[PDB]
């Protein structure tokens, strides 16, 4: 059983495919964007999959799935898992809590949060995969 066709423009790895999105966008607009193509922000959660992030990257930075909920103190990825994968650069993150808090892949794919009404040019979704 075969899990890697994907929609156009999107990229496959393993059981899922994603989207490199241009365009500068604050994060909850990059979350939107991300629902308007049936995908939502990517959740990272292996040293796979973040390579496969990481080799795709922009150089400018791009938004991804995790933001701080200060109802329960945690980042909490927009798929509902907690942190367990974790590409911190060092001394990250820093801005938990703080309430309005979201999280960032650098162009060296290490991660920082950041105030969500930052404007980052990339963004990144992911969705299943079908198969055959």
């Known amino acids: 059983f075969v899990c890697n066709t994907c929609p156009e423009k999107w990229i496959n790895f393993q059981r899922k495919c994603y989207y490199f999105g241009k365009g500068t966008k604050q994060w909850v607009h ?13 959740s990272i959660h292996s ?13 400018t930075g791009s938004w991804i799935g995790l933001r701080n909920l200060d109802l329960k103190g945690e980042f909490i990825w927009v798929d509902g898992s907690h ?11 820093t801005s938990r809590s703080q309430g309005e808090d979201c999280v ?23 969705r299943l995969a079908t198969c055959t």
């Open 30 to 42: 990059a979350r939107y964007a991300c629902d308007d193509m049936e995908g939502q922000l990517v």
């Open 47 to 59: 040293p796979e999959e973040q390579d496969f992030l990481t080799k795709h990257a922009s150089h």
């Open 83 to 93: 942190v367990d994968y974790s590409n911190w650069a060092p001394g990250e993150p």
């Open 104 to 126: 960032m892949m650098r162009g060296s794919g290490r991660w920082n949060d950041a105030f969500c009404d930052r404007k980052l040019g990339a963004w990144v979704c992911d």
